[PDB]
Design an enzyme around this catalytic site. Structure first.
Site, PDB file in Angstrom:
ATOM      1  N   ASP A   8      30.382  14.614  15.371  1.00  0.00           N
ATOM      2  CA  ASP A   8      31.413  14.082  14.485  1.00  0.00           C
ATOM      3  C   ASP A   8      32.517  14.874  15.116  1.00  0.00           C
ATOM      4  O   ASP A   8      32.503  15.771  15.549  1.00  0.00           O
ATOM      5  CB  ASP A   8      31.040  14.243  12.987  1.00  0.00           C
ATOM      6  N   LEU A   9      33.849  14.360  14.762  1.00  0.00           N
ATOM      7  CA  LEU A   9      34.821  15.012  14.960  1.00  0.00           C
ATOM      8  C   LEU A   9      35.545  15.946  13.680  1.00  0.00           C
ATOM      9  O   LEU A   9      35.581  17.153  13.740  1.00  0.00           O
ATOM     10  CB  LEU A   9      35.893  14.281  15.823  1.00  0.00           C
ATOM     11  N   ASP A  10      36.036  14.791  12.806  1.00  0.00           N
ATOM     12  CA  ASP A  10      36.875  15.475  11.708  1.00  0.00           C
ATOM     13  C   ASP A  10      35.932  16.263  10.841  1.00  0.00           C
ATOM     14  O   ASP A  10      34.816  15.975  10.254  1.00  0.00           O
ATOM     15  CB  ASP A  10      37.463  14.268  11.128  1.00  0.00           C
ATOM     16  N   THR A  16      40.441  18.482  11.115  1.00  0.00           N
ATOM     17  CA  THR A  16      41.365  17.429  10.741  1.00  0.00           C
ATOM     18  C   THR A  16      40.675  16.661   9.524  1.00  0.00           C
ATOM     19  O   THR A  16      41.593  15.713   9.047  1.00  0.00           O
ATOM     20  CB  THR A  16      41.233  16.633  11.768  1.00  0.00           C
ATOM     21  N   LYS A  45      35.249  11.244   3.317  1.00  0.00           N
ATOM     22  CA  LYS A  45      34.681  11.828   4.560  1.00  0.00           C
ATOM     23  C   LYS A  45      33.810  11.029   5.391  1.00  0.00           C
ATOM     24  O   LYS A  45      32.837  10.379   4.948  1.00  0.00           O
ATOM     25  CB  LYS A  45      34.060  13.231   4.388  1.00  0.00           C
ATOM     26  N   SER A 114      32.528   9.840  16.435  1.00  0.00           N
ATOM     27  CA  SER A 114      33.415   9.645  15.257  1.00  0.00           C
ATOM     28  C   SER A 114      33.824   8.372  14.777  1.00  0.00           C
ATOM     29  O   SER A 114      33.861   7.426  15.654  1.00  0.00           O
ATOM     30  CB  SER A 114      34.775  10.488  15.906  1.00  0.00           C
ATOM     31  N   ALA A 115      34.135   8.232  13.644  1.00  0.00           N
ATOM     32  CA  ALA A 115      34.699   6.906  13.002  1.00  0.00           C
ATOM     33  C   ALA A 115      36.198   6.810  13.363  1.00  0.00           C
ATOM     34  O   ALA A 115      36.742   5.828  13.057  1.00  0.00           O
ATOM     35  CB  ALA A 115      34.147   6.479  11.611  1.00  0.00           C
ATOM     36  N   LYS A 145      30.028   4.106   9.600  1.00  0.00           N
ATOM     37  CA  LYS A 145      29.416   4.999   8.599  1.00  0.00           C
ATOM     38  C   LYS A 145      29.518   4.583   7.191  1.00  0.00           C
ATOM     39  O   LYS A 145      30.545   4.306   6.711  1.00  0.00           O
ATOM     40  CB  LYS A 145      29.875   6.674   8.916  1.00  0.00           C
ATOM     41  N   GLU A 169      27.343  17.038  11.596  1.00  0.00           N
ATOM     42  CA  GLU A 169      28.191  16.210  10.592  1.00  0.00           C
ATOM     43  C   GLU A 169      28.660  17.109   9.504  1.00  0.00           C
ATOM     44  O   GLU A 169      27.855  18.012   9.132  1.00  0.00           O
ATOM     45  CB  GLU A 169      27.672  14.999  10.024  1.00  0.00           C
ATOM     46  N   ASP A 170      29.865  16.728   8.798  1.00  0.00           N
ATOM     47  CA  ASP A 170      30.568  17.435   7.729  1.00  0.00           C
ATOM     48  C   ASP A 170      30.473  16.673   6.367  1.00  0.00           C
ATOM     49  O   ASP A 170      30.788  16.978   5.400  1.00  0.00           O
ATOM     50  CB  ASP A 170      31.672  17.885   8.020  1.00  0.00           C
TER      51      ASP A 170
HETATM   52  P1  LIG Z   1      34.529  11.739  11.675  1.00  0.00           P
HETATM   53  O1  LIG Z   1      34.794  12.658  10.513  1.00  0.00           O
HETATM   54  O2  LIG Z   1      33.548  10.286  11.695  1.00  0.00           O
HETATM   55  O3  LIG Z   1      35.203  12.408  13.124  1.00  0.00           O
HETATM   56  O4  LIG Z   1      36.126  10.657  11.424  1.00  0.00           O
HETATM   57  C1  LIG Z   1      36.316   9.830  10.243  1.00  0.00           C
HETATM   58  O5  LIG Z   1      37.261   8.988  10.724  1.00  0.00           O
HETATM   59  C2  LIG Z   1      38.065   7.994   9.826  1.00  0.00           C
HETATM   60  C3  LIG Z   1      38.886   7.061  10.639  1.00  0.00           C
HETATM   61  O6  LIG Z   1      39.832   7.464  10.877  1.00  0.00           O
HETATM   62  P2  LIG Z   1      40.929   7.104  11.629  1.00  0.00           P
HETATM   63  O7  LIG Z   1      40.522   5.800  12.624  1.00  0.00           O
HETATM   64  O8  LIG Z   1      41.895   8.168  12.318  1.00  0.00           O
HETATM   65  O9  LIG Z   1      42.031   6.473  10.451  1.00  0.00           O
HETATM   66  C4  LIG Z   1      38.557   8.831   8.505  1.00  0.00           C
HETATM   67  O10 LIG Z   1      39.030   7.790   7.513  1.00  0.00           O
HETATM   68  C5  LIG Z   1      37.522   9.869   7.874  1.00  0.00           C
HETATM   69  O11 LIG Z   1      38.069  10.593   7.116  1.00  0.00           O
HETATM   70  C6  LIG Z   1      37.004  10.762   9.033  1.00  0.00           C
HETATM   71  O12 LIG Z   1      35.998  11.440   8.487  1.00  0.00           O
HETATM   72 MG   LIG Z   2      33.654  14.485   9.527  1.00  0.00          MG
END
Ligand SMILES: *P([O])(=O)([O-])O[C]1O[C]([C]OP([O])([O])=O)[C]([O])[C]([O])[C]1[O]
Ligand SMILES: [Mg+2]
Length: 221
Positions: A8-10, A16, A45, A114-115, A145, A169-170
């Protein structure tokens, strides 16, 4: 013996998730929805942009028009994109850069799951793009997700079975997506938020290749 790590990224690679929270809360308050506090945000999240907006709109009795729905998602994204322009290598979470280096030395594949459509921009901000063997495009999967599709696609993109991979993942939604993919999840956050049934670490300094091996060797998977 795992062969890939699916990131995952955020909230895993950098902080972020905090910026997505702040931006969603601001959006919600602009439309008179005041329920996006940190506890509610655990349900946001890992969830896609549109799914996030609809979870917030579910708090209201009345519907917005399709035109307003689109505007709102874009409004939030434009704010979020401004918030992340100054992200830099100094913002990579502890442990992450060294883990990427250690995985490459040990010929373990690295993929992004990442989503976020802002994922590639953020990896460039942090000088991390060159570590990734693949980035799974979140717009290509049919189901976001908590569906497992993005983790399955990240594994496929580096030629490794999900069952031979670890996912980091967080979030509640992303932990479920990892479980349903076949990969082994290791979460980062509070047990109170993420569960007592999988391995959870309190911060990303714990994400060492040594620890990933330690966890893999005890059932897993
Ligand atoms: P992860 O935490 O799956 O790296 O990122 C998730 O991304 C979505 C969609 O982001 P975007 O396309 O930049 O609007 C966010 O709504 C989630 O908070 C985030 O966890
Ligand atoms: Mg995340």
């Amino acid at each position: 013996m795992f062969k890939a790590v699916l990131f995952d990224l955020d909230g895993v690679i950098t902080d972020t998730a905090e910026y997505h929270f702040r931006a969603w809360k601001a959006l919600a308050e602009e439309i008179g929805i005041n329920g996006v506090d940190r506890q509610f945000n655990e349900q946001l999240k890992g969830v896609s942009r549109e799914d996030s907006l609809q979870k917030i709109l579910d708090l209201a009795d009345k519907k917005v028009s399709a035109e307003e729905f689109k505007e709102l998602a874009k409004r939030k994204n434009d704010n979020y994109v401004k918030m992340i322009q100054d992200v830099s290598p100094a913002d990579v979470y502890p442990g992450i850069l060294q883990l990427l280096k250690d995985l490459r030395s040990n010929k373990i594949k690295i993929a992004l799951a990442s989503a976020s459509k802002n994922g590639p921009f953020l990896l460039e901000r942090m000088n991390l793009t060159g570590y990734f063997d693949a980035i799974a495009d979140p717009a290509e999967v049919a189901a976001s997700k908590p569906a497992p599709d993005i983790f399955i696609a990240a594994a496929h993109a580096v030629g490794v079975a999900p069952s031979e991979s670890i996912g980091l993942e967080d979030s509640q939604a992303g932990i479920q997506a990892i479980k349903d993919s076949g990969a082994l999840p290791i979460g980062v956050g509070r047990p109170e938020d993420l569960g007592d049934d999988i391995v959870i670490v309190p911060d990303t300094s714990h994400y060492t290749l040594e620890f990933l091996k330690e966890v893999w060797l005890q059932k897993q998977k």
